[PDB]
Amino acid sequence: SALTPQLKDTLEKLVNSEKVVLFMKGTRDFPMCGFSNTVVQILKNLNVPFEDVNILENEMLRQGLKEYSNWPTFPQLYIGGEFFGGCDITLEAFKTGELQEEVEKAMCS
């Protein structure tokens, strides 16, 4: 395994600390990857507030999230403390309107 009871507890706490939490390569102002950039732009377009976490400077967290989310890469988007999806799924839910529905639901709880 790549995670422990404490790591899992912290991750659960981390993804629930804000309504929308984005795990990316780089920072919102300085995306290190095109895939990470697309999600940030999506989120900026919708005017939804969010927390961005750079996983390029913390391997334990990176490897733990891959297992926690059961998704091998980043970006990884969380909404309402539940894993929403990686790049492809976030882009599609954006075109579809499902992304917005999810965020609203989260913002209004």
Numbering used by the authors: 65 to 173
Which sentences from the paper describe this structure?
Arabidopsis chloroplastic Grx, AtGRXcp, was the first plant monothiol Grx to be characterized and plays an important role in redox regulation and protection against oxidative stress in chloroplasts. It has been shown that monothiol Grxs have diverse biological functions such as protection against protein oxidation in chloroplasts, biogenesis of iron–sulfur clusters in mitochondria and regulation of iron homeostasis.
The crystal structure of AtGRXcp has been determined at 2.4 Å resolution. There is only one protein molecule in the crystallographic asymmetric unit. The structure of AtGRXcp has a glutaredoxin/thioredoxin-like fold with a core four-stranded parallel β-sheet flanked by five α-helices on both sides. The groove is formed by highly conserved residues present in plant monothiol Grxs and would be the binding site for glutathione (GSH), i.e. a γ-­Glu-Cys-Gly tripeptide. Structural comparative analysis shows that a glutathione molecule may fit into this groove, form a disulfide bond with the catalytic Cys97 and interact with several charged residues including Lys89, Arg126 and Asp152. Most interestingly, similar to dithiol Grxs, ScGrx6, ScGrx7 and GrxS12 lack these five amino-acid residues and are also active in hydroxyethyl disulfide HEDS assays and have GSH-dependent oxido­reductase activity.
